[PDB]
Amino acid sequence: SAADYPIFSQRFTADPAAVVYNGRLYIYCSHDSDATPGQSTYNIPDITCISTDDLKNWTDHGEVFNAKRDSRWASVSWAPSIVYRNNKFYLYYGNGGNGIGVAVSDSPTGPFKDPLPGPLVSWNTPGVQPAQNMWLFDPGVFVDDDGQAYMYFGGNGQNNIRVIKLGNDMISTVGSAMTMSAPRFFEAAYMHKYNGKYYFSYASDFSQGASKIEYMMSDKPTTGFQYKGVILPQPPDNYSNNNHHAIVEYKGNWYVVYHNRTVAKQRGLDPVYQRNVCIDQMFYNADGTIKQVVPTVDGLKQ
Amino acid sequence: SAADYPIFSQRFTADPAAVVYNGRLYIYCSHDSDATPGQSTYNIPDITCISTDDLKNWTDHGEVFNAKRDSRWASVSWAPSIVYRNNKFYLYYGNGGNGIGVAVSDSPTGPFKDPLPGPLVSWNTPGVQPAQNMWLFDPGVFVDDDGQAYMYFGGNGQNNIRVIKLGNDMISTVGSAMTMSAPRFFEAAYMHKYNGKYYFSYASDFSQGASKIEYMMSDKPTTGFQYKGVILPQPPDNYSNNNHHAIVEYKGNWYVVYHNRTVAKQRGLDPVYQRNVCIDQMFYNADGTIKQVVPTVDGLKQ
Amino acid sequence: SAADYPIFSQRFTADPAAVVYNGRLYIYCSHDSDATPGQSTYNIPDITCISTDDLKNWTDHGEVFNAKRDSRWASVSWAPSIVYRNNKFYLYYGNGGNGIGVAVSDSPTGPFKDPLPGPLVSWNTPGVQPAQNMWLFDPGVFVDDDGQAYMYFGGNGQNNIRVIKLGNDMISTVGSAMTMSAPRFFEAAYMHKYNGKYYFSYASDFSQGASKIEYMMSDKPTTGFQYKGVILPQPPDNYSNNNHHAIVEYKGNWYVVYHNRTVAKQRGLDPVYQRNVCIDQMFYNADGTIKQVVPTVDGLKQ
Amino acid sequence: SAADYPIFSQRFTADPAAVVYNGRLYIYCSHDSDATPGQSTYNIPDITCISTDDLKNWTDHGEVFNAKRDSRWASVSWAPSIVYRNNKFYLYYGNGGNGIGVAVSDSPTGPFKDPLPGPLVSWNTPGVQPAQNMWLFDPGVFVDDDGQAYMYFGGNGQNNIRVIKLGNDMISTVGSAMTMSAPRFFEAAYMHKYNGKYYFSYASDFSQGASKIEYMMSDKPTTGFQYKGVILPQPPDNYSNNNHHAIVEYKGNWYVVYHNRTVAKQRGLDPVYQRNVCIDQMFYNADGTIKQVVPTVDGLKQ
Amino acid sequence: SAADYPIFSQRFTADPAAVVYNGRLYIYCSHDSDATPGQSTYNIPDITCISTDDLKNWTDHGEVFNAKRDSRWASVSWAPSIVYRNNKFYLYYGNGGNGIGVAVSDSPTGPFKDPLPGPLVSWNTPGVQPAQNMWLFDPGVFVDDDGQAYMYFGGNGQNNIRVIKLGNDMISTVGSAMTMSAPRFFEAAYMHKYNGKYYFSYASDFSQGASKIEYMMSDKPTTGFQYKGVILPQPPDNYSNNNHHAIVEYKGNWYVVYHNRTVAKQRGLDPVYQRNVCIDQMFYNADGTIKQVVPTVDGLKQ
């Protein structure tokens, strides 16, 4: 609610997001608390950003948003979503289960400032309720080719997906939230478009094995979806209820970016410095279904 | 018997139990012997208790029962079961395969004292025999809404489950033990009630893969059960023939608590201090079947 | 042959065998070479023996047979098989792929001496040939209730099992070797009898996953076998082409004893001192099929 | 009614009942009239009692209830039913087709006194009517584990079974009688509980061969019954429209007690003195169905 | 156990056994108590023997074994089994449910003396347990053509048959008891061999009509049995839970010998003097199944 914070909390993990701008891939991660190996003075609840132009050398940009300093109403910033529109960057975030915000910058590396007196989306946003034990913290924002922006969100049940239109200013909602359904939906609603088709990807629940990143396809953005399968199984995935992810096109290739300590350990570094954030290249079949995801082992040649 | 002590012994593990009282969740664990990493002076055969009000900060209450000091007849105390009734706490335990006892306290943190001159349940309790190679050490006690208490117990075979009525004083039996059956039943008979239905959960045997925690459902407490499936597979589960568990409601949510060194290692602490005891949140489908168990990653928000 | 020594060699592992005598369980292991962690002066090619009366406290008896000192013809002693008969102990062994020997003692702890001028069984023993790429090193000897002893042996193919009668003196063969077949037979032919039925157990090949210990049943010792299944999968088994095993009754219970570094590591000790040798209790279904194998976690109570 | 007295009359037979108390099995029998072999002064309409502690030596207690002396309203006492509750013995009886009574004693051997001014159950008890040609004389009383007592009664038709709740004082009814059905129901409704299941046993009619003692099972006491079969065929049964019976547990074994001159003749005595009352041991299958009834040929060893 | 003595007791009946020696057929019967028609001084618990050379004239040999005088440990001798081996006679017997003995003589007519300090077979003989409510009193001993003797025994359930090897001295056991199964097995396990096949005959239970003498066939003595049918229905059989029997070849013909008061009454004598012991000639079909049993009406012509 509330009540399910022990399982939905993103406090001890990092949720990633990605955007491409001016030849570079920017990766954003939430941070909250409290890593003390033995022992440690480690913290600072915020969103940070790293970038690259080659997928092997990374520049750390550090903190780009801190809810306490940079919003009027929020104290936490989980589960970023980032969009570039109107010559501006919009960074959506979850205040710890208590509302979804938006922060704005002229730069991909901030500083981002939330201009609103309260959450952009919350429990009393029209169309959210009724819901049975839905969670509100992890937005996925997408701008369609027609100029309509949408925010997908929700958690904890096949029918607990919502999608609401955003105004062109990207800091307002238009109309009521709509409902969607996806088999075993848990968290991490995400939308991208490729070759005329819409891909709703998400973290599945724990009802038939581990949570995985799975997806549906449609020819429309909010209706007509058909489940297609698993993007990323991740043997063995878990730790820590975190399949937050981004799917982005960069220099003509598609990539899935996700956080996974175990997988990152069997691969090498900590992106001087950001996690634990893995990047695999994604391929499509001729029919638009996802063919495969392949681990990256090197950077771009040029 | 006896003969099967090499496989049923709980001597080198911790069996958990749980009760909620006055806003707190209490977790009890058996201890017996003999952990010497390199080397060690480590021991003391007893039951200990920890508690929380938030699932992240734990208070250690230490030893609450020691069979040698606190019973007239027993020397060991494996596999606790704890009930709050009659403004008292009843802590049932296994004397190492040689009888099941009951100890009583006015406090959840003891001291508990077994008032009886011998075991509450033993091999010659009516209805236990005949049995082929049954084990007697791990009771699960449950008080139904009608005021009838039951103790479920048994081990080592599909038909080696017993259930006997307890008197309202919780320190006596009424009538003969009855028999139950469950596919691949090994150990750890346990009963809880939710939404008008009875859930018999248990550790399965090693006949088709590892032992797992599995369950059946019924509309009655001792008959009419139908097998429903696996609660907790635990890849890869084993070490050490220990799927002792509790299923408890706390602050409106359901939790399964179980002991698993491997799983606890891939997660963090030792509950300052108790194990190795993992807590996952449990969810039900509309039909009452268990939907999923999800790892807890944080404590309650308030 | 020869040619397949790189895969059949037992040089860097320990092959176990077991017998019960005068209230104690004796475990024998072959040793050959050459364990140098960093670095090491470690060796001595022989068979050693440990024993217990409780499955938790072990007495080391050390070396009981050394082929170079204790035979006239052999230099190596892999893959022991041990039988007690005629108030004597017979220890069969493989000379490194070059013949099967027998050594005899009045004591379970030796010294064992091979009385023969050459191998008891070899490539030119009648009935062995023809064979396509059969291996000769790992005997399983069994004495039936009628007083007929048999040695089972062979390797590397479904039809590469042989069984020959032994004389009552246990140091001679009678008649020709006979052929047997078992699905995916690799190594480690072994025979035991329980409740009137004969159990041919063996290591399977690598054709459908890892090698496992599998079995067949018959009402006769050398014909009429029907494959029944896997005794021990061992996730993930391998290292090092070694599913040599014994199946023995001790104090009314059945045990499978096998060598597995990985499994032993997830369990504890090194049997002060012998490996890496794991002991699980085995259970049968009413029809005689093997129900399950359960890890031992403790010793006998008395 | 009335009209069917020529076939339902128990005047020339003995109807048995049984209870266990303080280590002894007590058998009660009704007597009415009028046995004159050639000739005889033989009579006295009442209920008598015998007991044993070993099933071979019997003590005669004689008359324990005489309706004319010991009730205010009744003249006959057929078809006893006996229960021990509240440190008292309750003996229910049929006044010859004209109402069902209850008599009470502090002793199993009386004297029993009916305290009521009229029948406990009669034709105008609510829920009895409507009925087509039902007979009211042979109660079977049972106290469930929840403390609810029930009296089963009725006769002469598949749908002519009634069951009414009794108060905890055992001398009053609560609410209306309920209806039950059983294939070919004739007389002698009887209830016992074993291993969580309820057994409705009864005398069947003469529609497909002789009357037999048959039964149904349920998980509830008054609904959900399914016919299971014949308990006691008795080749050839008849003489004299009397399959009144008891089913009782004594010293860990189950027994069916029934009256049958023919069977008793092919067996021996007259229980110094009571009939003609046969005792067979009853066995159950694992599923709770009745496996068999076996003639007793001897008494208990100790 | 114990508990089932009221149904398994052989106290008031005679259990027969038979052997052929030196041209004569010897019939042995147990006696225990207590026949008092009106009245009687009748008794003496023992085994007696009669013989014939023509099946019509019988010689009474009287008592051949009395447990109190002729054993060190037993007080009763039910259910004889007799074998001639090693120029000696071995008479096995049941001590009233408390162990199976063996007594030995140089003569078929005794005196037989049990040389052992305790029972040959008892509850703690290896392989007997576990058993659910098995009875131990009625051995059937058989010596196979290979020189292996076996004792079959058990009671009260389809899976409650045991068979153990005897040493060649016939007064010791070898190895553990093995289990067998037979449909509806009650008592009176018996083995004979004819034309290369093994015939397990037995008394069936009361689950589908009266107990009968039924049988199975195998090509092996302790495994591979297939139920074949009823040997002897005996309309109407019963009185007194006694289908103890022998099947013996005499002068080229096969006979079944059994105790049945009712059948003997419809036939004539009391074998000057032994019962009630009926002798029918048995015939086989070409396939080895039992064709028929025919009442004898006369003796041998020569």
Automatic annotation (TrEMBL), chains A, B, C, D, E:
<feature type="binding site">
    <location>
        <position position="244"/>
    </location>
    <ligand>
        <name>Ca(2+)</name>
    </ligand>
</feature>
<feature type="active site" description="Proton donor">
    <location>
        <position position="187"/>
    </location>
</feature>
<comment type="similarity">
    <text>Belongs to the glycosyl hydrolase 43 family.</text>
</comment>
<feature type="site" description="Important for catalytic activity, responsible for pKa modulation of the active site Glu and correct orientation of both the proton donor and substrate">
    <location>
        <position position="138"/>
    </location>
</feature>
<feature type="active site" description="Proton acceptor">
    <location>
        <position position="32"/>
    </location>
</feature>
<protein>
    <submittedName>
        <fullName>Carbohydrate binding family 6</fullName>
    </submittedName>
</protein>
